[PDB]
Symmetry: C2
Subunit: 385 residues, 2 copies
Amino acid sequence: MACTIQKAEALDGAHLMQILWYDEEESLYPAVWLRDNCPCSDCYLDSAKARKLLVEALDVNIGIKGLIFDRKKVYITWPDEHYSEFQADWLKKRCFSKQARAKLQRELFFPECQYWGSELQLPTLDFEDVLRYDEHAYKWLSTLKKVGIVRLTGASDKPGEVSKLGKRMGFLYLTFYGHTWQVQDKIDANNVAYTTGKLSFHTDYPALHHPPGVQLLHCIKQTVTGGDSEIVDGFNVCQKLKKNNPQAFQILSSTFVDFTDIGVDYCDFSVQSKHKIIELDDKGQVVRINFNNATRDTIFDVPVERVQPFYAALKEFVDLMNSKESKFTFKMNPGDVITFDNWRLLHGRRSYEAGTEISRHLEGAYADWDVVMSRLRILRQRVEN
Amino acid sequence: MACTIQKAEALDGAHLMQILWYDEEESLYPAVWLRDNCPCSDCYLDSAKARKLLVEALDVNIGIKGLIFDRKKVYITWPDEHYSEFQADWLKKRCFSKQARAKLQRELFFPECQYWGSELQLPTLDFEDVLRYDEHAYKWLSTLKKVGIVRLTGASDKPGEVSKLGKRMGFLYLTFYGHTWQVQDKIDANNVAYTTGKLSFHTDYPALHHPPGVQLLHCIKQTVTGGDSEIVDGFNVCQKLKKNNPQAFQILSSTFVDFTDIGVDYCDFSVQSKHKIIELDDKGQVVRINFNNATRDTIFDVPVERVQPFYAALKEFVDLMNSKESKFTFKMNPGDVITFDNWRLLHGRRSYEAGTEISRHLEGAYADWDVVMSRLRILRQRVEN
Ligand SMILES: C[N+]1(CCCC(=O)O)CCCC1
Ligand SMILES: C[N+]1(CCCC(=O)O)CCCC1
Ligand SMILES: O=C(O)CNC(=O)C(=O)O
Ligand SMILES: O=C(O)CNC(=O)C(=O)O
Ligand SMILES: NCCCCCCN
Ligand SMILES: NCCCCCCN
Ligand SMILES: [Zn+2]
Ligand SMILES: [Zn+2]
Ligand SMILES: [Zn+2]
Ligand SMILES: [Zn+2]
Ligand SMILES: [Zn+2]
Ligand SMILES: [Zn+2]
Ligand SMILES: [Zn+2]
Ligand SMILES: [Zn+2]
């Protein structure tokens, strides 16, 4: 009844098609959009699922010349004698009502979000299961999207495990630090991460204009002298900052900060960027945090009178992250892998002691959110069918 | 005189340092920023050129406790007895005056832009020269940035040339179509590009939220039956659209359009995105065009009353691109490579005839603008030294 056609007709100077469905709901489809989306082989390349029709071929003032219909299809003639068929179910899905469009957007983009603080129960799956079973890889990526982090247990204590996860998604995101990289204390370290020091809360790689969406960290070797992990939900922290100090939130969400990274690793590099630390979409919702205090430049491209208030705002933001209500602390053991949303979470680690042999070793990599979402879309289809 | 210190002193409750330079110009440096940027080994990891100092260690209300200076250095004591030295030239570069900050930003980001229409003289360099000589690779990337396109002549007529250019920059940007991809007519084509049809003006890969910054196309085989190239300067076209039809510009710069790509190539994929076709920065300047009519979805996430005006705006934009004042047409020969700014230019090709053997073959690849800019920064330093 919902997707069965009861009536179809051209309205409003034939510039609109109205479908009355058998449940008595009505849907409206502009004629220009119908013409633009003709599925015939002249207009649409089925092997590619892509539009061949050019904007140049489209009369934006077009109207329907003739229309007949049955319960499952509409058949339209156009003014220039072009001919189109549209399926009822295809039409129903693309209904222009707010409810129908929002339902479809949810299906495409998985927007459901669960914010957390120190009460987090770390979602945990088995590593080999995720590699082997679509049901498990689906739970992995969907939970990664919703919660921002999933721990995988039972990997080996050898390099190469993040690369398996990379292939499971599709491919890893290459950067100047390599396809994968080794987190260990290094002589003449080219990054603060490659020392035994504390890492305060940061996102990785704000020196890029498109920071990595998803980060993978696999514990090969752990030390008993420190090196615990800490994470925080930046979207949760931002919400609290907006509530507690709207001025601080306004400053961090509007001030461009310069980031830098110069050195040599997989290739030689001299990287510069600008980001707002709290990055809002066109509706004022936080979509990304861009903040690593190590790679924030000495160069600061603001008028002098804005400098101290910026630092005061930043300090408030960091104090919120460190609060016992926000922060979640845990320790990785050999064989553990954490996979997390590097646009949403901030992460850190406690200092540990240096010595003459390597006491601590993580292997890490990145993936692009679009690559992850693609896999998530495919998995959902496989597991629901 | 300009970078020699005549006087240094703490002002405004000791919350500011003022430098009077020997040319009588004055510079102001907030004390919090000085403390934040202490170059000592406790605060700053020289091997990484990175800040070790935590936000947590920074007193945002700090003032200078004591200061002495000579012509080339300032020496500061802080309230907690921490001690800092700053070099005159380092200070001068980071002066908070608008002029000094703007000069430095120009140096970091190469913003100079030369807009063009049908009068374009295609910048052209030799392929092997660019691989061999820093002076030539510098001209290549700087011209790529400024003009949006450079042609390279004298490459081979074999696969593998774009990969050499990839290594020259640093590395190529992997996508679902491969590290490199072959533009040829293909049975069961997964993309309109892989047919003999016309490609109207488009940017590549708006189905990704971070479309490729730079595109490389190398002509291996060309056909005499058509297959000419066309390019247009989207930033130039956008400027003209804003002048001729502000309503059309407002619509295209504010309406989110859904893009899609589903299929199988280097991996299996189901990719979805949303973009404004004309993407403005926070100041209203165009920073990216996101438009491929083939991969624009049938799904269109707008209220019905916004649909036809969107199409009317799009048609006006495309008509401007096609105008004889805007468009530049040329034909690639075997051995030619074009490298262009895929965020700024739109490109297309004329249809050609199918047949039983491959009559036309391009190899293409992408690179990230941050990767290109990094190389550009390094080259400039090498060639100026
Ligand atoms: C790629 N690595 C992180 C980049 C963090 C940052 O420089 O923002 C380099 C050090 C370990 C992982
Ligand atoms: C990577 N390729 C372009 C993508 C153009 C697009 O699908 O937006 C796939 C066809 C040839 C190059
Ligand atoms: O070493 C750790 O526990 C965490 N490392 C990082 O956050 C990093 O390398 O960027
Ligand atoms: O084939 C050409 O001349 C141009 N090709 C494309 O724009 C493409 O493959 O995306
Ligand atoms: N069942 C309706 C079929 C209409 C076909 C029209 C061909 N021009
Ligand atoms: N030339 C000035 C050197 C000052 C050194 C001070 C050490 N605390
Ligand atoms: Zn149905
Ligand atoms: Zn058709
Ligand atoms: Zn990190
Ligand atoms: Zn290299
Ligand atoms: Zn000097
Ligand atoms: Zn110091
Ligand atoms: Zn293209
Ligand atoms: Zn694959």
